[PDB]
Design a protein around this ligand. Structure first.
Ligand SMILES: *[C@@H]1O[C@H]1CO[C@H]1O[C@H](CO)[C@@H](O)[C@H](O)[C@H]1O
Ligand SMILES: [Ca+2]
Length: 516
């Protein structure tokens, strides 16, 4: 892995449950068989969406957690773990959504204004999730829902491994900037979602608060705004994305736009920890969507990320760190293209996120964006997950591997692995001062023969006089590896004469020793 280390010793594999209810897709008895089978294939837990539209359907405080409880009983029966997702977002409408579960309709009647939903640059209304600006309603409803859910799941705390919060559309912390109805679907540039009267006045009040008066605003922006009502979000999203963002006005607007998401994160994080910490004591996570298109577009840099609310990832991650939430990033199965017209740089994105995350000490998890039906993708996920310190990986979705033993088998081999600590020893390595020793091997866990940035470093054992290291390897997998010396200047000086192997890596910790 990067910086001379190995895979994450806490790595776990998860599987996404169907979007629809189990009894609508199969039956409980079969479901339990399926779970035992998944467990057999290296899956640690099943992530599942518990829809707000189901749990508080008829009215305020008119809760129905019967399905969630029944589901948990079967998970318990199958000897598995579960990761519930408190889905305060609508099912149906997003990529891969085979369902139709909008949020509770009575919720919209809580306000007279347009504070609860979204309005795009072109007037498109979005109601698949509550606008984070309506923090008063969010604090009430999410607080009530999180607290009620905790009470209902208290009996099944032992099968709950983690809890996911829905920070926005499709369960990710973002704005609904890319939709068919808004004409912003992939690979197009996204549209800003702050055109409701409520959003306009909020930005305006935010600016006035920062500068005090219009006279100070105009000074800061080098503008000639006539009245305070002239303080508004981007009139032309395209021009803003081309050059507008570079001005003091553009920077302030982007600061506010993303800030709303940061504040939302700290809010739901606070509510979640208050409702779950004493009872479950499990990690709580939230997701950041992988908006890879229009990444390296020369005319509109990040034309899809910015409208989604992603301006400064470093600042955004700081919000997760503060809210004490683990982060989950999507798109691990894809690679960079960076060509017209899509300008997709998915792999680059993940690398920066991972680097930032690990840099801030944030626990990182990942998931695939689209259904995988080819082992090559699994291999791509493996390289990222095992070299960028991912604590977990979630496979979308259930039906893909549950009904395809071939894919299932490949998943087991490549990703359904158990990390085990082992000791690697190399005898009589011809080194001189300035020389460091490393090992690299065939599997992704071993850096895939890479000597540049993924090799695993070994250290000299003063006592016994040999180079050795405590490396984390996948248990019960056949591996091939070779040690090599790297000079003080960072270049490979030499290689171990014979290629080493461990067929397979033992489940119990021990050591592999060989001479140079
Ligand atoms: C964007 O979690 C990523 C995938 O989103 C889809 O699956 C989610 C998990 O099952 C679900 O929450 C979301 O509604 C669906 O579109
Ligand atoms: Ca309520």
């Amino acid at each position: 892995a990067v910086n001379g280390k190995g895979m994450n010793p806490d790595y776990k594999a998860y599987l996404m449950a169907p979007l629809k209810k189990i009894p609508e897709v199969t039956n409980w008895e079969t479901f339990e068989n399926d779970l035992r089978w998944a467990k057999q294939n290296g899956f640690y837990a099943i992530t599942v969406d518990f829809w707000w539209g189901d749990m508080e359907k008829n009215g305020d405080q008119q809760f129905d957690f019967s399905y969630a409880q029944r589901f948990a009983q079967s998970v318990k029966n199958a000897g598995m773990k579960m990761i519930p997702i408190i889905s305060t977002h609508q099912c149906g409408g997003n990529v891969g959504d085979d369902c139709n579960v909008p949020i509770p309709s009575w919720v919209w009647n809580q306000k007279s204004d347009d504070s609860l939903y979204f309005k795009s640059e072109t007037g498109t209304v979005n109601k698949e999730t509550l606008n984070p600006l309506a923090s008063d309603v969010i604090r009430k409803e999410y607080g009530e829902l999180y607290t009620a859910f905790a009470a209902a799941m208290k009996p099944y705390k032992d099968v709950i491994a983690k809890i996911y919060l829905s920070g926005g559309p499709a369960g990710e912390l973002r704005y609904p900037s890319y939709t068919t109805s808004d004409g912003t679907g992939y690979p197009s540039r996204g549209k800003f979602q702050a055109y409701t009267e409520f959003a306009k006045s909020k930005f305006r009040l935010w600016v006035l608060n920062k500068y005090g008066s219009l006279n100070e605003v105009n000074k800061a922006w080098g503008t000639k705004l006539i009245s305070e009502l002239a303080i508004l979000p981007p009139s032309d999203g395209e021009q803003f994305l081309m050059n507008g963002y570079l001005s003091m006005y553009g920077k302030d607007y982007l600061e506010w736009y993303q800030g709303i998401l940061e504040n939302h994160t700290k809010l739901i994080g606070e509510l979640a920890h208050n409702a779950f910490d004493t009872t479950f004591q499990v990690p709580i996570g939230a997701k950041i969507a992988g908006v890879h298109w229009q990444y390296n577009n020369p005319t509109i840099p990040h034309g899809a990320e910015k409208p989604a609310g992603y301006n400064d990832y470093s600042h955004l991650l700081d919000a997760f760190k503060s809210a004490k939430l683990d982060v989950t990033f999507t798109c691990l199965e894809m690679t960079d293209k960076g060509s017209y017209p899509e300008y997709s740089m998915p792999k680059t994105l993940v690398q920066n996120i991972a680097t930032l995350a690990n840099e801030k000490g944030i626990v990182l998890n990942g998931e695939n964006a689209l259904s995988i039906g080819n082992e090559e993708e699994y291999k791509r996920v493996a390289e990222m997950a095992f070299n960028y310190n991912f604590a977990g990986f979630t496979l979308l979705r259930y039906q893909d591997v549950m009904y395809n033993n071939s894919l299932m088998g490949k998943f087991k081999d490549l990703l359904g692995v158990t990390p085990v600590m082992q000791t690697i020893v190399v005898k009589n390595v011809p080194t001189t001062i300035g020389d460091t020793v490393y090992i690299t091997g065939n599997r992704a866990e071993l850096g895939s023969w890479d000597t540049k940035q993924y090799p695993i470093q070994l250290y000299y054992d003063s006592h016994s006089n040999d180079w050795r290291g405590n490396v984390v390897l996948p248990a019960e997998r056949n591996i091939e590896f070779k040690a090599f010396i790297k000079s003080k200047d960072g270049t490979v000086k030499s290689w171990q004469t014979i290629q080493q192997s461990w067929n397979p890596v033992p489940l119990k910790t021990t050591s592999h020793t060989s001479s140079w």
